[PDB]
Write a protein that holds these residues in place. Structure first.
Motif, PDB file in Angstrom:
ATOM      1  N   UNK A  94      33.126  65.234  41.496  1.00  0.00           N
ATOM      2  CA  UNK A  94      33.576  64.994  40.113  1.00  0.00           C
ATOM      3  C   UNK A  94      32.485  65.215  39.079  1.00  0.00           C
TER       4      UNK A  94
ATOM      5  N   UNK B   3      44.368  59.387  48.095  1.00  0.00           N
ATOM      6  CA  UNK B   3      45.048  59.529  46.811  1.00  0.00           C
ATOM      7  C   UNK B   3      44.065  59.363  45.656  1.00  0.00           C
ATOM      8  N   UNK B   4      43.141  58.404  45.763  1.00  0.00           N
ATOM      9  CA  UNK B   4      42.241  58.108  44.652  1.00  0.00           C
ATOM     10  C   UNK B   4      41.269  59.257  44.409  1.00  0.00           C
TER      11      UNK B   4
ATOM     12  N   UNK C 240      41.210  61.718  41.080  1.00  0.00           N
ATOM     13  CA  UNK C 240      40.097  61.873  40.146  1.00  0.00           C
ATOM     14  C   UNK C 240      39.776  63.346  39.911  1.00  0.00           C
TER      15      UNK C 240
ATOM     16  N   UNK D 263      42.424  65.138  37.940  1.00  0.00           N
ATOM     17  CA  UNK D 263      42.374  64.722  36.546  1.00  0.00           C
ATOM     18  C   UNK D 263      41.185  65.317  35.805  1.00  0.00           C
ATOM     19  N   UNK D 264      40.089  65.609  36.508  1.00  0.00           N
ATOM     20  CA  UNK D 264      38.936  66.226  35.860  1.00  0.00           C
ATOM     21  C   UNK D 264      38.996  67.750  35.804  1.00  0.00           C
TER      22      UNK D 264
ATOM     23  N   UNK E 245      51.385  58.865  43.737  1.00  0.00           N
ATOM     24  CA  UNK E 245      51.099  57.725  42.871  1.00  0.00           C
ATOM     25  C   UNK E 245      52.379  56.995  42.482  1.00  0.00           C
TER      26      UNK E 245
ATOM     27  N   UNK F   2      53.417  54.925  45.267  1.00  0.00           N
ATOM     28  CA  UNK F   2      52.544  53.780  45.487  1.00  0.00           C
ATOM     29  C   UNK F   2      52.690  52.703  44.420  1.00  0.00           C
ATOM     30  N   UNK F   3      53.236  53.038  43.247  1.00  0.00           N
ATOM     31  CA  UNK F   3      53.417  52.019  42.216  1.00  0.00           C
ATOM     32  C   UNK F   3      54.441  50.965  42.625  1.00  0.00           C
TER      33      UNK F   3
END
Lengths: 173, 173
Positions: free
Chosen positions: B84, B125-126, B130, B133-134, B168, B171-172
């Motif tokens: 990242x 997933x995390x 990231x 998203x970047x 996601x 997972x919510x």
């Protein structure tokens, strides 16, 4: 005594003081660097640290102490690794009670980002860029999942995004 | 012999082999974990490691070795912190020769993201979130700065974004 190895209860008590007391306590604390040197942290401790830093760095009276605290913050694992991972971890939170409390911590993070882009614009470009690139995704995820976001938070995030975009544009040449 | 303590020259020589040899060499190497355990790295070494992982994890023959390599990759500081930060550092690169070479490494990163979202969808997933998203921010920065982006790269990034969005969402609840 505990003004060196800043603990959870110590920061809880320190938060109640006025911003000057908080920022002077952090600037003269030896363990501040060791406080922010954790890439992994609990949600409650991270949120308390963000609240304390938001209140301390808002002190419109103690410029040298705010300078020292922000200088330690920008070079710390807390801002580089811990905060982005927490912002990304917002998206997969099942519990609604924590999702509803996330906007306050997002506002605190955006306030600290404004502090960084105003006090350390040149040397804190990477960390603030990573955070302002990760924030809108979690904001859209919370907005779609029922959690409302304050409009002032969106305004502040767009302002810091504009400042960071102009700094990146001026660094490309 | 020297297949432990994965060095730059060893990975340079290993990249020339076929994907099966690369993935079996990495899966049976003790130091692979220590290779990816660096949150900070040189651009050349990071790009070589990404090329090696792209070629190895593409092996459509050795499932256990790809599983082991991707399992070490998803829990490593290389994917969590190093990649990242490297993606964010693209935006403030002044040199045009490196900006023009960035698209190949971006394609390699997106390929590794596809590998992760297909082999370890639940537990990665995390980290993949990231990076997805970047990536569009640095892609817009490179597109505005003259560096062209391949259409297939954009297609792959949108596909992995859709998969991650659905993970996601699931997972919510």
């Amino acid at each position: 005594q505990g003004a060196k190895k800043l603990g959870y209860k110590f920061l809880e008590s320190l938060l109640q003081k006025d911003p000057s007391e908080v920022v002077i306590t952090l600037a003269t604390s030896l363990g501040l660097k060791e406080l922010l040197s954790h890439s992994s942290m609990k949600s409650n401790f991270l949120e308390l640290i963000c609240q304390v830093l938001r209140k301390a760095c808002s002190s419109k009276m103690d410029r040298q102490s705010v300078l020292h605290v922000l200088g330690i913050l920008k070079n710390s694992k807390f801002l580089k690794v811990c905060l982005p991972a927490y912002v990304v971890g917002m998206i997969t939170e099942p519990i609604p009670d924590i999702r509803n409390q996330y906007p306050e911590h997002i506002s605190n993070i955006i306030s600290l980002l404004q502090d960084l882009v105003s006090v350390f614009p040149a040397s804190s470009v990477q960390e603030t860029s990573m955070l302002v690139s990760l924030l809108p995704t979690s904001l859209n995820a919370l907005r779609a999942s029922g959690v409302d976001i304050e409009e002032e938070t969106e305004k502040n995030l767009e302002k810091v995004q504009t400042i960071i975009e102009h700094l990146q544009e001026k660094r490309r040449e």
